[PDB]
TrEMBL record, chain B:
Its main location: secreted. Residues 2-121 form the NEAT domain. The lineage of its organism: Bacteria, Bacillati, Bacillota, Bacilli, Bacillales. Keywords: Cell wall, Membrane, Peptidoglycan-anchor, Secreted, Signal, Transmembrane, Transmembrane helix. The gene is hbp2. This is Cell surface protein. It comes from Listeria monocytogenes. It is found in: Secreted, Cell wall.
Amino acid sequence: GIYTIPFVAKKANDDSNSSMQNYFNNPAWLKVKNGKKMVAMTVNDNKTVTALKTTLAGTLQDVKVVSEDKDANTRIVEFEVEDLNQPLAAHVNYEAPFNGSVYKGQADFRYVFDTAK
Amino acid sequence: TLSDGIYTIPFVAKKANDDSNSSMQNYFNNPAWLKVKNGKKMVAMTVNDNKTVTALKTTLAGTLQDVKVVSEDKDANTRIVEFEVEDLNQPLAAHVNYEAPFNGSVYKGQADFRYVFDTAK
Ligand code: HEM
Ligand code: HEM
Ligand SMILES: [Zn+2]
Ligand SMILES: [Zn+2]
Ligand SMILES: [Zn+2]
Ligand SMILES: [Zn+2]
């Protein structure tokens, strides 16, 4: 990475913060690779966040896992962003302990990058 | 409406924004007790996981007010809560604070839900 970009994970259907805001470290890394804009960020709870997909060419595509650190329960993910100036639609799969079982959920949210800073 | 007396009343804890069941339904024992005294309708129910459910509030006179704890059994991890209900024929808005074990940590959460009561017997 070279450029740093702050972001907020917002809800899918409103402008309030998503619960996903607690799961990513700020700011993200921003770089150009083969002419494309690549954003990288640390997922701070590797075990809970089981899958992450972001919008690319009209479909939700799995982010690239760059690095994984099971000892620290973190991983670094990277994804291509077509337009940094618009909210980016994302889809997450998660797992959490619940009343003696494992609750498996999924949700949509949006990344909003602070490009005007 | 109901005369002064004691009844059982089934209920369902529903989500705040839709009519599906809330995850809170697993935390309360059914049916609730309903006591009517001097025209005041009091609902009492057992919270079956005293440590997880840290606070509970229900709508009374247009605002969320803490429920009354009427019995607590720390050894069994349960408690009985009681609250006044103005109209049993409408969903009752509630708020919960909870603590959940979360992979060695304790997650502190909060959520809204609604109690929906069936006919008292
Ligand atoms: C036992 C644990 C959990 C329960 C019972 C739970 C329950 C729910 C429910 C009912 C919804 C609302 C869906 C709708 O719009 O209809 C929701 C949304 C959501 N949940 Fe979970 N959830 C749990 C754990 C988690 C965890 C661990 C995460 C972390 C990734 C998470 C992230 C989300 C997200 C991101 C949303 C969408 C709203 C937002 O952007 O904040 N949930 N969850
Ligand atoms: C690690 C554990 C947990 C996490 C991370 C978690 C996370 C969440 C999240 C993100 C939501 C969605 C909020 C929204 O509407 O945007 C939610 C909703 C909810 N959670 Fe949790 N939660 C956990 C455990 C539990 C537990 C143990 C309870 C039991 C009291 C619980 C009860 C609820 C309730 C009642 C809702 C609202 C949906 C419904 O009525 O079922 N959660 N939780
Ligand atoms: Zn989705
Ligand atoms: Zn005891
Ligand atoms: Zn004892
Ligand atoms: Zn609330």
